Amino acid sequence: QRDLSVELGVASNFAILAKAGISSVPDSAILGDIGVSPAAATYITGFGLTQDSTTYATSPQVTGLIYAADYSTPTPNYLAAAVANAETAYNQAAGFVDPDFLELGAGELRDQTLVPGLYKWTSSVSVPTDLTFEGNGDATWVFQIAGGLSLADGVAFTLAGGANSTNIAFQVGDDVTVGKGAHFEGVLLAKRFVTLQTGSSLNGRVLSQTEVALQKATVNSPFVPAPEVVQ
Amino acid sequence: QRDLSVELGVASNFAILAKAGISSVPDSAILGDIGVSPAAATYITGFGLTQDSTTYATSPQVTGLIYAADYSTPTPNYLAAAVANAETAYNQAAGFVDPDFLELGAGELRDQTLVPGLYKWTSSVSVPTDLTFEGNGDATWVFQIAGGLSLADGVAFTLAGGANSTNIAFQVGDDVTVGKGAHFEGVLLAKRFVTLQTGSSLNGRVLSQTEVALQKATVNSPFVPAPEVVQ
Numbered sequence: 001q002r003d004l005s006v007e008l009g010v011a012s013n014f015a016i017l018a019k020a021g022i023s024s025v026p027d028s029a030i031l032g033d034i035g036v037s038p039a040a041a042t043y044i045t046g047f048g049l050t051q052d053s054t055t056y057a058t059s060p061q062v063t064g065l066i067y068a069a070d071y072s073t074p075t076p077n078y079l080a081a082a083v084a085n086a087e088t089a090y091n092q093a094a095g096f097v098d099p100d101f102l103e104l105g106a107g108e109l110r111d112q113t114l115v116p117g118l119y120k121w122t123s124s125v126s127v128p129t130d131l132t133f134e135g136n137g138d139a140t141w142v143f144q145i146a147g148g149l150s151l152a153d154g155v156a157f158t159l160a161g162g163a164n165s166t167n168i169a170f171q172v173g174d175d176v177t178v179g180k181g182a183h184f185e186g187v188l189l190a191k192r193f194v195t196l197q198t199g200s201s202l203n204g205r206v207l208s209q210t211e212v213a214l215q216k217a218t219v220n221s222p223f224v225p226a227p228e229v230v231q
Numbered sequence: 232q233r234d235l236s237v238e239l240g241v242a243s244n245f246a247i248l249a250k251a252g253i254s255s256v257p258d259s260a261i262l263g264d265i266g267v268s269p270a271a272a273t274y275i276t277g278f279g280l281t282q283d284s285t286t287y288a289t290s291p292q293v294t295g296l297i298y299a300a301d302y303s304t305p306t307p308n309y310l311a312a313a314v315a316n317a318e319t320a321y322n323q324a325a326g327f328v329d330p331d332f333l334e335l336g337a338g339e340l341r342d343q344t345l346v347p348g349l350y351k352w353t354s355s356v357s358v359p360t361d362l363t364f365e366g367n368g369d370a371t372w373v374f375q376i377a378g379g380l381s382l383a384d385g386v387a388f389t390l391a392g393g394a395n396s397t398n399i400a401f402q403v404g405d406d407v408t409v410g411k412g413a414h415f416e417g418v419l420l421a422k423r424f425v426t427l428q429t430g431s432s433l434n435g436r437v438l439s440q441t442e443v444a445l446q447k448a449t450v451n452s453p454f455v456p457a458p459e460v461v462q
């Protein structure tokens with residue numbers, strides 16, 4: 001019943017967006033664009049970046065484009081808006097009041113099934129086992145985590161009942177780590193570091209205010225609609 | 232006392248933004264960028280556009296850059312966001328309830344002094360004489376006009392008491408016309424056509440969902456902060 005949609009603005013153009021840097025131990029696999037701002041291109045590492053034709057770059061690990069804050073106009077302002085929009089989104093997700101679940105499992109989410117609503121914690125959160133999201137194509141979930149977030153090696157987020165991960169948002173105050181072969185679902189609004197350990201995969205987006213590290217990770221963000229030109 | 236700020240997102244990057252076209256009878260003089268989307272560059276007329284180096288154009292009449300929806304990546308998505316943000320802003324300005332002034336002067340604003348607040352009309356609005364905005368550096372005004380808006384030749388909008396035109400918004404449902412040598416203050420959220428007649432001037436921005444016509448007009452939009460790069 002409650003609308004806990006989070007608005008992402010330009011950030012919904014990005015598989016990954018980071019303020020300070022993005023790194024990869026290859027081969028990672030990214031479906032969607034990636035960007036850093038205010039960081040310049042030197043802080044996107046492990047991608048073997050080739051430039052054009054000079055407002056973006058390409059990389060074999062990115063199906064899509066790579067944007068850095070020191071690229072040619074209008075990328076800088078394109079990125080600044082994505083970043084500010086990402087900050088706006090973080091703060092909205094954190095802004096929600098009157099949670100439905102408070103301190104659930106003392107921070108440990110074990111063989112859980114999460115119904116739609118607001119989940120808050122004052123601690124870190126560990127997911128030792130598979131976690132299920134159940135509700136309809138329109139149900140929204142928001143998670144407010146004041147500490148860090150981890151998923152144990154091999155755990156999967158799975159969707160049930162028609163749940164859509166464009167409607168799942170994680171606001172996290174401290175470092176996030178997705179263990180090896182683990183699977184993540186939703187939009188990751190991280191104030192600090194994010195690490196996607198080897199062979200981990202993520203259906204959603206990663207928006208970090210510091211740094212994003214991928215270790216042979218797979219990131220699949222939703223497609224962007226082609227803005228339709230009037231010739 | 233009331234916060235009637237309107238959020239413009241990427242549109243605050245633009246002196247002028249239009250959906251269907253921008254035209255000029257030269258020399259107009261624009262401080263700030265201009266853009267059309269979803270329209271392509273063929274619909275920016277009278278500007279003698281030179282292209283780069285291919286994601287934007289220049290024109291002697293534009294101190295700043297020109298963006299069209301058919302320019303090279305990432306301009307299309309840069310523009311789509313500016314445009315959608317402009318639509319969001321229009322709808323917010325129209326969305327406000329409980330006006331302070333309703334049907335003021337039966338649509339005619341004559342030797343008026345407008346205090347901060349919500350002004351609504353179900354009609355068109357004519358300004359036959361100079362109009363004064365009085366309030367502080369933080370006071371906000373919003374105008375909801377269901378019909379058109381005109382300023383008579385030679386009339387000026389003037390600011391008093393520390394009023395700031397970044398805090399003045401006009402939402403207008405039908406064509407706008409600023410007469411010859413007339414002077415406009417504020418953000419113009421126009422659902423249809425906008426015409427700035429010969430020698431008219433505007434301190435603010437013009438955001439139109441159809442077409443913008445300038446006739447030797449002067450448009451001065453607020454400066455955009457350089458997003459500050461981390462090399």
Ligand SMILES: *[C@@H]1O[C@H](CO)[C@@H](O[C@H]2O[C@H](CO)[C@@H](O[C@@H]3O[C@H](CO[C@@H]4O[C@H](CO)[C@@H](O)[C@H](O)[C@@H]4O)[C@@H](O)[C@H](O)[C@@H]3O)[C@H](O)[C@H]2NC(C)=O)[C@H](O)[C@H]1NC(C)=O
Nearest residue numbers: 012136137138159162163164165166167222223224225228
């Ligand atoms: C999870 O939830 C996501 C968030 O909504 C869904 O995203 C999609 O939802 C619908 C999937 O079909 C899409 O709605 C469709 O939109 C098209 C748009 O086409 C054009 O739209 C123009 C307006 O901009 C119009 O001129 C005209 O309608 C034109 O056709 C529309 O045609 C369809 O009728 C339908 O309304 C929606 O656009 C899309 N959203 C995004 C962000 O891409 C996911 O589908 C959903 N997935 C699952 C597994 O549940």
Ligand SMILES: *[C@@H]1O[C@H](CO)[C@@H](O[C@H]2O[C@H](CO)[C@@H](O[C@@H]3O[C@H](CO[C@@H]4O[C@H](CO)[C@@H](O)[C@H](O)[C@@H]4O)[C@@H](O)[C@H](O)[C@@H]3O)[C@H](O)[C@H]2NC(C)=O)[C@H](O)[C@H]1NC(C)=O
Nearest residue numbers: 243367368369390393394395396397398453454455456459
């Ligand atoms: C009309 O109202 C406009 C809307 O506010 C005003 O716009 C300006 O307002 C202030 C004019 O001085 C500006 O505030 C200043 O912001 C600078 C920012 O500098 C840097 O900011 C970083 C954060 O992003 C920080 O790292 C650090 O602060 C750094 O210095 C700040 O330094 C100043 O202390 C001050 O706060 C404001 O930025 C600016 N807004 C815009 C949109 O440009 C107009 O000034 C006002 N004009 C009139 C005539 O009343």
